[PDB]
Amino acid sequence: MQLTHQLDLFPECRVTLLLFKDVKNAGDLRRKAMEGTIDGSLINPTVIVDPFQILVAANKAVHLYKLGKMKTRTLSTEIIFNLSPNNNISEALKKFGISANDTSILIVYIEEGEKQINQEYLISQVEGHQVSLKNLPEIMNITEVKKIYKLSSQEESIGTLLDAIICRMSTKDVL
Amino acid sequence: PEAEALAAARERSSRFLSGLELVKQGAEARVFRGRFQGRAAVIKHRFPKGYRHPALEARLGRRRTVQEARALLRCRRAGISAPVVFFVDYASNCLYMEEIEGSVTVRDYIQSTMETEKTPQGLSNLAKTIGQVLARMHDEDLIHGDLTTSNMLLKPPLEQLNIVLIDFGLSFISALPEDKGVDLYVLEKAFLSTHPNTETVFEAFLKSYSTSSKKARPVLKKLDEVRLRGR
Ligand SMILES: Nc1ncnc2c1ncn2[C@@H]1O[C@H](COP(=O)(O)OP(=O)(O)NP(=O)(O)O)[C@@H](O)[C@H]1O
Ligand SMILES: [Mg+2]
Ligand SMILES: [Mg+2]
């Protein structure tokens, strides 16, 4: 099943998370996202350590989308870029996006007002099993997180990994 | 930036901020508290005063906000406990950060500890810990820019002496021992005219600073210079 949160700063916008395991049509979904035929952002679920991560990225994405000041082409790509610790757009869509061999995929989309997204059709497009977002810990790989964010011993000594992750995401646009 | 779009972001951000619990209306900024996507949060709004050239006004709010955001990142990476940055809105100059739930400023702990103890000697352990924190901070070449006892919090459980630094709007990077001693001298002045008869306690912090920083000797010599020159 799904996970949905309102955005505090943009109250008419819902952010919805969908998680899938045993995904067979990985590369196909990938090319369908490049095309613009599938809804939302396809994210590498193994380096997401918490929905708060996705929500911080979605909040900054909607903020710059409304300002017409995004770094990437679309809202869907902006969400993924904000997940990156650094400002290299291409490394970021490649790393935090889905690979051809992914068997786990996370779908994040943003609805505003009453314009809904065909959730059934989007689930309809994935050859895999939509699991509760509660299973995200099973799919998240702390080793890969600590590697792609380059998290210190020093950072672990004064907070969570989530906390260091959020701090890099939230301040990279000034560093 | 489209004018209409920008103004909409500003009125969106103040609509949100209104309704929140005001924590502190300060000289340059308002601090509110609330929730940000499920987490306990504090929001520092560097509001425009209208009493000056709005270009100068917005430049100032922006530079403070960018300075604090940059420092809070640099603290986290360097193992220096300060609030996690959630989101920085540069259209309005608001910093969204984790609230240090239940915190007490170090100033309030000092005044409340010298009204019951009647002595500063119970504060020595506080002093030592602060020496460690500022030591590590200075050793990564971070200058706080406004070291006061109101810009240090104590994270519950209060008695473990878990210190969290805050207010980095004037922070910056420098290996200059003079800049570090100036940082310490601002703190000493703060002590002098906030917590009377705490000179024993500043020296206690200084001793522990000397011990936990191996770049300390030049810093303390420059601090003596600054004490003398007064600047
Ligand atoms: N992250 C936080 N968690 C909890 N309390 C906080 C936090 N940040 C600030 N506060 C409280 O709100 C006050 C404002 O913090 P500060 O960063 O010093 O803003 P300021 O601009 O300096 N306002 P002022 O100190 O009056 O000039 C602090 O003195 C604390 O009492
Ligand atoms: Mg202050
Ligand atoms: Mg301030």
Residue numbers in the entry:
A (entry chain B): 1 to 175
B (entry chain C): 17 to 247
How is this structure described in the published paper?
Here we describe the crystal structure of human PRPK–TPRKB bound to AMPPNP (adenylyl-imidodiphosphate) at a resolution of 2.53 Å. PRPK roughly adopts a kinase domain that splits into the N-lobe and the C-lobe. The ATP analogue, AMPPNP, is bound in the cleft between the N- and C-lobe. The C-lobe is considerably smaller than a typical kinase. TPRKB uses helices α2, α8, and α9 from one side of the β-sheet and the loop between β1-β2 to interact with the N-lobe of PRPK. Specifically, invariant lysine (K60) of β3 makes direct contact with α-phosphate of AMPPNP (~2.6 Å), and E84 of helix αC forms a salt bridge with K60 (~2.8 Å). In PRPK, the exact 183DFG185 plays the same role, with the D183 sidechain carboxy oxygens in close proximity to both Mg2+ ions (within 2.8 Å). Surprisingly, the activation loop is completely absent in PRPK, substituted by a 7 amino acid linker between the DFG loop and helix αF. F184 of the DFG loop reaches into a pocket formed by L88 and H160, adopting a so-called DFG-in conformation, which helps maintain the D183 sidechain in a position capable of coordinating magnesium. Collectively, both spines in PRPK are well assembled, suggesting an active conformation.
The p53-related protein kinase (PRPK, TP53RK) was initially cloned and described as a p53 interacting protein being able to phosphorylate p53 at Ser151. Its binding partner, Cgi121 (TPRKB, TP53RK-binding protein), was identified by the same group through a yeast two-hybrid screen. Thus, the human KEOPS complex is composed of OSGEP (Kae1 in yeast), PRPK (Bud32 in yeast), TPRKB (Cgi121 in yeast), LAGE3 (Pcc1 in yeast), and GON77. Bud32 is responsible for the ATPase activity of the KEOPS complex and ATPase activity is required for t6a synthesis.
